[PDB]
Every structure is written in structure tokens, then in C-alpha cells.
Design a protein around this ligand. Structure first.
Ligand code: HEM
Length: 137
């Protein structure tokens, strides 16, 4: 289920974080603009780079903490509020996060592993509706 998925992801956080983030960028290439440091670089160029790995690690670590504090895939308001009020997210809209979760769910469905893909879809929808409530456009 969802809790075991969080354990799987956490067990190999840097690998899953990199692979899902690159799935996102490659599915929605206009999103790369938000990451000036990653423009014009292959997946392997990025996987060799400690700072790309460090970035993806820190993002997915917080995503797993939000997921683990959720009840029935409903995230905490306080956690949606952290994500809206981070300086780093000042330019973003809920569509940026929707696209990340579509990529994550597609990644999980394509994986061959027994991820609870539908729970991640519901988590992402519930997180988008919480970001909107906390004032994201
Ligand atoms: C649930 C989803 C997300 C989480 C948990 C999250 C979390 C984070 C965290 C923890 C950082 C700081 C990384 C560090 O300290 O090195 C960060 C930075 C950032 N995030 Fe997010 N993020 C999310 C979604 C997004 C999305 C969808 C976008 C854009 C499409 C975005 C754009 C950024 C940018 C541009 C930075 C600054 C990167 C840098 O300075 O190197 N994030 N995010």
C-alpha cells in the first residue's frame, strides 16, 4: 500500500528521486525552465552531478515526510502551507505540482513494481487542493 511505497522510496531515495524528477522534466520539458542549472544536460550528465542528486534527494525527502504525515492520503494543512510559503516556490502554480504527480504516477505504473499508484494519484490531487487553499494560484 501507500505506507509500504513510502518505505520503498525512502530505502533508495536518491535513485527514485532522480528517476522520477527526470521523468517529470522529460514528460513536461517546459518545466525545465524553473531549473536554469539543468538546461541543456542529459540524464547521465545530471546523475553524475552531486548537486542534482542533492536537490532531488531534499525534494523527495520532504515529499515522503508530507506523505507519511498524511491520513488516508490527505496531507496536513501545515505541510501544504510550508510548500506554498517556501521562497523557492514563489513563482509556482498548482499545475506545476499536478504535472509532477502525473509523472510520478506514470513512473509507478510503468515500473513493474506493486506501487499503490491510485493512492499516489489521490495524494497528489489532495495535495493540489491543499496548496490552492493555502493560496497557491
Ligand atoms: C511535493 C512537491 C515538492 C516538494 C516536496 C518540494 C520541495 C523542495 C525542497 C525541499 C527544495 C529545497 C531543496 C534544497 O534545499 O536543496 C525545493 C526547491 C525548489 N523547488 Fe520544490 N518541491 C516540490 C515541487 C516543486 C515543483 C513542482 C517545482 C517546479 C516545477 C519546484 C521548484 C523548485 C525550485 C525551482 C527550487 C529551487 C532549486 C535550487 O535552488 O537549486 N518544486 N523544493
Amino acid at each position: 500500500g501507500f505506507k509500504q511505497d513510502i518505505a520503498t522510496i525512502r530505502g533508495d531515495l536518491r535513485t527514485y528521486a532522480q528517476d522520477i524528477f527526470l521523468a517529470f522534466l522529460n514528460k513536461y520539458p517546459d518545466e525545465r525552465r524553473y531549473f536554469k542549472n539543468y538546461v541543456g544536460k542529459s540524464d547521465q550528465e545530471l546523475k553524475s552531478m552531486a548537486k542534482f542528486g542533492d536537490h532531488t534527494e531534499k525534494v523527495f525527502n520532504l515529499m515522503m515526510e508530507v506523505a507519511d504525515r498524511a491520513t488516508d492520503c490527505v496531507p496536513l494543512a501545515s505541510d501544504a502551507n510550508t510548500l506554498v510559503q517556501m521562497k523557492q516556490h514563489s513563482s509556482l502554480t498548482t499545475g506545476n505540482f499536478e504535472k509532477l504527480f502525473v509523472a510520478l504516477v506514470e513512473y509507478m505504473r510503468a515500473s513493474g513494481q506493486s506501487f499503490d499508484s491510485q493512492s499516489w494519484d489521490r495524494f497528489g490531487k489532495n495535495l493540489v487542493s491543499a496548496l490552492s487553499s493555502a493560496g497557491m494560484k
